[PDB]
Design a protein around this ligand. Structure first.
Ligand SMILES: *C(=O)N1C[C@H](NOS(=O)(=O)O)CC[C@H]1C(N)=O
Length: 268
């Protein structure tokens, strides 16, 4: 048997569709499974969103205070609800968007990037600027949770998002000082313990951004480093469209997919 057969069994067992991509390196072949099929971003767009805002502004822009109201909180926003009275700086928003997957923080970052009607097109244009012609963001949270399976809106592919993440973390899409902020926020993420992290041994370093949604959607995108500093990019995406809109996401599906990947990357 081969790795595609292992990934197929994961699908049968969880009644799920799984997509995996890990770029080739000098010493490892690409891992690709449904790598060109579309999957909802869910919250994973917030990583390249923070990069867009870092890229387009001096670091001093991170100190800009954004004020907002309870009316702006229409999605799960653990950090933004706490700071609604005093406001949050662009920096704080980037922090929240990545580390708590904060929906209001992402929406305010979208508005900072392209204005109130223009944010999702501007975010998408950032992706186009990086050579990603595939991904698209069309709505903001929470409206983007309503796209049904098969709708191209608000989707990426394992291929596309891993390659974006690669440029951002391991390439030169950002200058070192901006890159480090992205990397720090993803390193300090609070939401991915049970996903890619759970597939990799404790001496591999992991940074990540998750997403979850309706139709059983669960994603994670990460950069991992070997104990000797060898970097790899892992995108794992899933949905469970079988069980309808209220199908439960399965984090363990992602942990298992990650374990299959780690078995390839870690075993010499
Ligand atoms: C992101 O997909 N979302 C924001 C928040 N955190 O989820 S994540 O950690 O899996 O990124 C809650 C769910 C979801 C949403 N529906 O907007």
């Amino acid at each position: 048997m081969d790795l595609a057969d292992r990934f197929a069994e994961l699908e049968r067992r969880y009644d799920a569709r799984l997509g995996v991509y890990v770029p080739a390196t000098g010493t490892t072949a690409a891992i690709e499974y449904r790598a060109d099929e579309r999957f909802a971003f869910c919250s994973t767009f917030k990583a390249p969103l923070v990069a867009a805002v870092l890229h387009q502004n001096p670091l001093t822009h991170l100190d800009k205070l954004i004020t907002y109201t309870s009316d702006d909180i229409r999605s799960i926003s653990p950090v933004a609800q706490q700071h609604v009275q005093t406001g949050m700086t662009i920096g704080q928003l980037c922090d929240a968007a990545i580390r708590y997957s904060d929906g209001t923080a992402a929406n305010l970052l979208l508005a900072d990037l392209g204005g109130p009607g223009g944010g999702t097109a501007a975010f998408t244009g950032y992706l186009r600027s990086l050579g990603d012609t595939v991904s698209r963001l069309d709505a903001e949270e929470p409206e983007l949770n309503r796209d049904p399976p098969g709708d191209e809106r608000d989707t990426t592919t394992p291929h596309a998002i891993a390659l974006v993440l690669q440029q951002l973390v391991l390439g030169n899409a950002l200058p070192p000082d901006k890159r480090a902020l992205l990397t720090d926020w993803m390193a300090r993420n609070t939401t991915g313990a049970k996903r890619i992290r759970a597939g990799f041994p404790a001496d591999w370093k992991v940074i990540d951004k998750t997403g979850t949604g309706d139709y059983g959607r669960a994603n994670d995108i990460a950069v991992v480093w070997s104990p000797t500093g060898v970097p790899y990019v892992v995108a794992v995406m899933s949905d469970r469209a079988g069980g309808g809109y209220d199908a439960e996401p399965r984090e363990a599906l992602l942990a298992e997919a990650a374990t299959c990947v780690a078995g390839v990357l870690a075993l010499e």
